[PDB]
């Protein structure tokens, strides 16, 4: 139950909110913590300049000092007694190194930091962030560099819509892995959100209350196995890429759980891009990464 | 020579800065314009139950609705006589649909819109923007939704540092395709930037920088540019290029990338910039 965390280190700043969040989690749930950082310098392939002696001496010469850096930035935690393993890998293509360390390693979680400049604008993602969000097999927890709202709320977005049988397991996993988590922190404020589209321009009006006929019910099929009753479940219409973020904001939600199976969701990509809170994509298992 | 433009329509707002820029270009360079927009609706995803017929009907009604919508936003350009071609394709994964239309129609340039709130802040890119920036065989012009700097300035970033001759071919492609274009549009000023990063480092630094001044002076005088507009700095390009670009009054920056997708080396350069972007594939570059 989330007890082997992989923390992605940002080499461009000193504060690592991913690490801090990992520690906060460790204080409530426990597990391992691995400060990971793929590093690289352009100096290593200019072969016309440095023979292998100089270039590899410098290759290890970066790794050592940046490992020292991560130590100097995890020092208070280490001295306080937090079991943090530090590992700096020499790698081009960062996201690749991260995913490989996830698979070889044995990880429950990946915690990376995302930026937010202004209070009510969306969080800023990098290509690396996106690669992880669609290729990383482990549940990815994107942690924004902004403090958690004092009213803690977890939000679960469900693909209620499609009657397909692989979206059902993912739903129940999303909820279950959220309930086993919220209980263990806590707060334990778990909301359930569905989003369905009403088709606007044979009578169209039947399709509408049919779409909603399934949605209200399917949403509630989750709930009575999972005991989340009506008060914090939401079924609204409009576009998911707008329905769930503003909802998350009016709700004062600090995190949202997302599910993707397989670009991987332009339906969900647009959802992510206009988000202003923490993100937890749980790719369901039973999936293999390229 | 960019005379068959593909304009990506943002379906979440009404103003299309990509279209506006495309027209602006059309007035000085000429060519065609194709207003493109990939769309998809969840109803088509509902296998049950809409009988295949009405599902195609609602498909047709969404396509029709967006054709009317895009028509209604370019009419001031259309009635005035701008050859704007509208084509709405039905696709769930937009970047795929865009690249397919690029290769199928053979387009010279793709103009898409990126947001920027604030000055001295970075530009915001979408997943679609990133797929296009690394898989689109044609030059991609990301146009921010902010007015062009009143002092027009163009900047070209080259991988001078690493010696291999296809990065050289790509370099001069960048250069030629930037000046021959600025020349025909607004006579803007095209700058060129390099970035550079027994035991003894002190020799290594001045060996690399000795190299950069080499290659920069090798490039510049084939293109008849002045040393007054060549710049070579040390530090990381992902930090070097934006500070210069803002200090230089740059409105756009031309980038050179080869697939084997785009390295993190330049990806970081892209995420941190605050002006228009023009990514150029070496050609031919083959999209999967
Ligand atoms: C589905 C997620 C349910 C658990 C949410 C985790 C709560 C995190 C609280 C963060 C508190 C902080 O602001 C960190 C700190 O003070 O160092
Ligand atoms: C490499 C590209 C260099 C060519 C310069 C392009 C100039 C475009 C300036 C846009 C002028 C406007 O401000 C008109 C508008 O509102 O779109």
Residue numbers in the entry:
A (entry chain A): 3 to 203, 212 to 272, 280 to 307
B (entry chain B): 3 to 199, 211 to 273, 280 to 307
The authors write:
The universal stress proteins (USP) family member UspE is a tandem-type USP that consists of two Usp domains. The UspE expression levels of the Escherichia coli (E. coli) become elevated in response to oxidative stress and DNA damaging agents, including exposure to mitomycin C, cadmium, and hydrogen peroxide. UspA, UspC, and UspD belong to class I; UspF and UspG belong to class II; two Usp domains of UspE belong to class II and IV based on the sequence and structural analysis. USPs might be associated with several functions, such as cadmium binding, ATPase activity, and an intermediate in lipid A biosynthesis.
Specifically, it presents the three-dimensional X-ray crystal structure of the recombinantly produced UspE from E. coli at 3.2 Å resolution. UspE exists as a monomer, and the structure reveals a compact and 2-fold symmetric dimer in the crystal. The crystal structure shows that UspE is folded into a fan-shaped structure similar to that of the tandem-type Usp protein USP from P. mirabilis. UspE is composed of ten β-stranded mixed β-sheet and nine α-helices. More importantly, we found an unambiguous stick-like electron density in the hydrophobic pocket of E. coli UspE throughout the refinement process. In addition, the stick-like electron densities were very similar to a 3-hydroxymyristoyl group of Uridine-5′-diphosphate-3-O-(R-3-hydroxymyristoyl)-N-acetyl-D-glucosamine. The characteristic hydrophobic environment in the pocket indicates that UspE can bind unidentified ligand with a 3-hydroxymyristoyl group in the cavity. This pocket was surrounded by hydrophobic residues in β6, β9, β10, and α6. However, the ATP binding motif of UspE was disordered in the crystal, due to the intrinsic flexibility of these regions. Our structural analysis indicates that E. coli has two putative binding sites (Site I: His117, His 119; Site II: His193, His244).
